Amino acid sequence: SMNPPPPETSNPNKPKRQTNQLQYLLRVVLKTLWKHQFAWPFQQPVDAVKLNLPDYYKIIKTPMDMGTIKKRLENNYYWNAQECIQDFNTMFTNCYIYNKPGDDIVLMAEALEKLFLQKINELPTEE
Ligand SMILES: Cc1cnc(Nc2ccc(OCCN3CCCC3)cc2)nc1Nc1cccc(S(=O)(=O)NC(C)(C)C)c1
């Protein structure tokens, strides 16, 4: 195959904002998920060439990963928390679409998602 370029993480033409919810998403949510024992397959874009998955980007047209999310948060790429939450959800969904239920990678994603939802429930209120 060829891998696609990774998702954009910095846009000089996109307005930037720093809020307590976005700060929480970086300093608590991203941080906590990153350190999970099953996080590492989700820490960078899927290298479908290295993994020998010629159909990966035929099926997954909206790829997302936590390396990308980390950079977007760092670069104040998001205007609001929902845009970031959507990226996490896209990452999980992508795993559940490409892989069979019960597969080891799916069980890993499910562990991360449970933790994610726990942290999102404790999202601070704005301002
Ligand atoms: C985010 C993500 C979503 N889906 C997948 N699916 C997937 C990945 C690789 C696959 O290859 C199957 C056969 N090989 C697996 C290792 C020996 C040969 C089959 C399916 N992988 C993902 N990431 C991933 C990243 C790095 C390594 C691997 S892995 O192939 O080592 N799979 C685990 C053992 C981590 C479950 C997987």
Swiss-Prot record:
The record marks N99 as: Acetylated histone binding. Ubiquitously expressed. The lineage of its organism: Eukaryota, Metazoa, Chordata, Craniata, Vertebrata. Residues 17-123 form the Bromo domain. The NET domain mediates interaction with a number of chromatin proteins involved in transcription regulation (NSD3, JMJD6, CHD4, GLTSCR1 and ATAD5). The C-terminal (CTD) region mediates interaction and recruitment of CDK9 and CCNT1 subunits of the P-TEFb complex. It is also required for maintenance of higher-order chromatin structure. It comes from the Eukaryota. Chromatin reader protein that recognizes and binds acetylated histones and plays a key role in transmission of epigenetic memory across cell divisions and transcription regulation. Remains associated with acetylated chromatin throughout the entire cell cycle and provides epigenetic memory for postmitotic G1 gene transcription by preserving acetylated chromatin status and maintaining high-order chromatin structure. During interphase, plays a key role in regulating the transcription of signal-inducible genes by associating with the P-TEFb complex and recruiting it to promoters. There is a cross-link at K58 (Glycyl lysine isopeptide (Lys-Gly) (interchain with G-Cter in SUMO2)). Changing N99A: Abolishes binding to acetylated histones. JQ1, a thieno-triazolo-1,4-diazepine derivative, and I-BET, a benzodiazepine derivative, have been tested on tumors with success. Treatment with GSK1210151A (I-BET151, a I-BET derivative) has strong effets on mixed lineage leukemia and promotes myeloid differentiation and leukemia stem-cell depletion. This is Bromodomain-containing protein 4. Phosphorylation by CK2 disrupt the intramolecular binding between the bromo domain 2 and the NPS region and promotes binding between the NPS and the BID regions, leading to activate the protein and promote binding to acetylated histones. In absence of phosphorylation, BRD4 does not localize to p53/TP53 target gene promoters, phosphorylation promoting recruitment to p53/TP53 target promoters. Interacts with p53/TP53; the interaction is direct. Interacts (via CTD region) with CDK9 and CCNT1, acting as an associated component of P-TEFb complex. Interacts with RELA (when acetylated at 'Lys-310'). Interacts (via NET domain) with NSD3, CHD4, BICRA and ATAD5. The interaction with BICRA bridges BRD4 to the GBAF complex. Interacts (via NET domain) with JMJD6 (via JmjC and N-terminal domains); the interaction is stronger in presence of ssRNA and recruits JMJD6 on distal enhancers. Interacts with NSD3. Interacts with NIPBL. (Microbial infection) Interacts with bovine papillomavirus type 1 regulatory protein E2. This interactions may serve for the tethering of viral genomes to host mitotic chromosomes allowing successful partitioning of the viral genome during cell division. It is found in: Nucleus; Chromosome. It is linked to Cornelia de Lange syndrome 6: A form of Cornelia de Lange syndrome, a clinically heterogeneous developmental disorder associated with malformations affecting multiple systems. It is characterized by facial dysmorphisms, abnormal hands and feet, growth delay, cognitive retardation, hirsutism, gastroesophageal dysfunction and cardiac, ophthalmologic and genitourinary anomalies. CDLS6 inheritance is autosomal dominant. Signal peptide: none annotated. Belongs to the BET family.
